[PDB]
Amino acid sequence: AMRLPDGTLQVMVEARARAQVTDYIPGPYLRARGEVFSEIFPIDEAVVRVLVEELKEAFEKYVANHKSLRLDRYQLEAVKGTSDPAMLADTIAYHATWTVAEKQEILELTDLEARLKKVLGLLSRDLERFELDKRVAQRVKEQM
Amino acid sequence: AMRLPDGTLQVMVEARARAQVTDYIPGPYLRARGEVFSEIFPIDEAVVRVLVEELKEAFEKYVANHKSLRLD
């Protein structure tokens, strides 16, 4: 909780669980109503943990190749000691930079297991994007 | 079978054996005559228990492959 009364208040929040937005209250400033924490999730958590291990593998492949995103290696140092698959899945989903729409659709889906598949798909998409970025780099050099 | 003071009849059932059906009785409500309760006993259980083990292994593999379903 940083107190900066100069036009920018920096509040760092650790989210607990998603909830359904009931309605909206016109502002400014705006309000919204929500339900209790989303404590219902699918099971077969063992395969979810296996997919968490594979997600750590994929994110290690990601950040090591994605050094042009200026993302520090410290973000690869926090996936150790993971006591819950959901926190690691969300951390990897936010720590990889792409369009805000995909990051938000990661939140909107209440399915625990489909979120990991979405994260893996988007990580592979950014991987192939980096691959063709390199490809067109040498291609444009050859064009010169 | 216990009463719930809310508007729902709460009764636990458990099937024991299947019975053949001969004819129906007009309703409401419906009745049925029970002729026999046919259910074969396990005879020469070696093959039966081998298939039981295989069936349980197959069901375990069925449970271990959920990605959009929920089974406890």
Side-chain angles (χ1 to χ4, degrees):
Chain A
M2 211 165 308
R3 281 304 309 267
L4 294 175
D6 52 357
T8 299
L9 287 166
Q10 304 170 359
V11 60
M12 281 135 277
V13 288
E14 175 161 356
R16 305 290 186 179
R18 53 194 66 88
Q20 306 176 1
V21 178
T22 301
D23 54 353
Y24 54 93
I25 297 89
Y29 55 95
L30 73 164
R31 294 284 186 93
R33 299 184 75 252
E35 194 176 0
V36 299
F37 311 93
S38 179
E39 299 163 352
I40 187 167
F41 289 115
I43 46 182
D44 200 1
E45 301 282 333
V47 180
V48 187
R49 296 290 298 164
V50 174
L51 203 57
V52 160
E53 304 294 325
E54 275 183 346
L55 197 64
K56 290 188 287 185
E57 276 186 347
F59 199 55
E60 284 171 356
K61 296 167 184 177
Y62 181 89
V63 184
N65 278 310
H66 285 99
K67 288 293 182 286
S68 66
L69 298 180
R70 293 168 178 82
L71 297 168
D72 282 326
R73 63 183 64 87
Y74 284 100
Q75 286 188 353
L76 285 169
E77 282 283 327
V79 296
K80 294 182 286 188
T82 297
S83 66
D84 181 68
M87 61 79 71
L88 184 141
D90 287 322
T91 304
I92 289 184
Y94 185 78
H95 275 176
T97 63
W98 53 64
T99 65
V100 189
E102 298 166 357
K103 289 177 178 291
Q104 188 58 218
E105 182 65 26
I106 288 166
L107 176 62
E108 303 279 314
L109 294 173
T110 186
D111 277 331
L112 174 73
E113 294 174 348
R115 197 170 69 245
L116 282 72
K117 290 290 198 288
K118 181 74 182 295
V119 171
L120 283 166
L122 293 177
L123 288 178
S124 67
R125 194 257 310 163
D126 202 356
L127 286 172
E128 51 87 14
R129 272 170 182 244
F130 192 85
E131 295 180 7
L132 182 135
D133 296 337
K134 301 179 292 182
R135 173 74 174 179
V136 307
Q138 73 268 14
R139 180 51 73 92
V140 73
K141 165 65 166 60
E142 291 150 348
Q143 296 299 332
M144 321 305 317
Chain B
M2 91 175 268
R3 304 288 87 81
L4 294 174
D6 53 356
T8 302
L9 275 295
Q10 197 275 334
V11 172
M12 281 135 278
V13 308
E14 178 182 0
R16 196 179 77 227
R18 61 180 65 94
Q20 65 183 177
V21 180
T22 304
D23 197 72
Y24 288 95
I25 296 89
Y29 50 89
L30 290 179
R31 301 283 294 266
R33 291 192 289 267
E35 195 74 26
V36 292
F37 301 102
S38 182
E39 189 71 29
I40 192 66
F41 291 98
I43 303 299
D44 201 353
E45 299 177 356
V47 187
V48 187
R49 73 176 174 262
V50 167
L51 279 71
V52 160
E53 294 176 356
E54 287 176 347
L55 195 144
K56 186 59 178 68
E57 286 171 348
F59 183 73
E60 186 189 6
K61 301 290 285 184
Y62 187 87
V63 171
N65 294 319
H66 300 167
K67 289 302 176 294
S68 67
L69 305 177
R70 291 186 183 95
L71 280 176
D72 280 333

